[PDB]
Amino acid sequence: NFNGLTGTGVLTESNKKFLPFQQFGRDIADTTDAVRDPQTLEILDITP
Amino acid sequence: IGKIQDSLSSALGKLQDVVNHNAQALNTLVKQLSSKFGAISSVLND
Numbered sequence: 083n084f085n086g087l088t089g090t091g092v093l094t095e096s097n098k099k100f101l102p103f104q105q106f107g108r109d110i111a112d113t114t115d116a117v118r119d120p121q122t123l124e125i126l127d128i129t130p
Numbered sequence: 131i132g133k134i135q136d137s138l139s140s141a142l143g144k145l146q147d148v149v150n151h152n153a154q155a156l157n158t159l160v161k162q163l164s165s166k167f168g169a170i171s172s173v174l175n176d
């Protein structure tokens with residue numbers, strides 16, 4: 083649970099770069115596939 | 131035989147069409163997981 087985003091999966095260190103107001107990223111077909119950790123502010127991919 | 135190679139190197143629409151059709155259907159299947167059909171939300175956790 084990332085401040086509201088509830089899900090399941092493996093979390094992994096990312097190498098994408100959000101814009102500094104975007105929280106999570108979505109795929110085509112609209113599924114959450116990246117998040118940003120609120121405390122440390124790093125992007126993490128979400129694989130099933 | 132040397133001209134087939136130019137005309138292709140420079141036409142496979144019947145093969146492209148069946149790929150496109152299948153992808154367009156698989157995307158429509160997933161995009162339906164976000165409709166209510168007359169419910170309060172689209173999420174079972176809601």
Ligand SMILES: *[C@@H]1O[C@H](CO)[C@@H](O[C@@H]2O[C@H](CO)[C@@H](O)[C@H](O)[C@H]2NC(C)=O)[C@H](O)[C@H]1NC(C)=O
Nearest residue numbers: 085102103104105118119120121122123124125
């Ligand atoms: C939220 O609070 C934590 C501590 O409660 C902050 O963690 C600190 O991060 C800095 C990095 O700039 C470290 O130098 C400190 O030692 C950390 N403190 C602790 C207690 O670990 C965290 O930075 C805060 N969130 C934000 C966005 O700043």
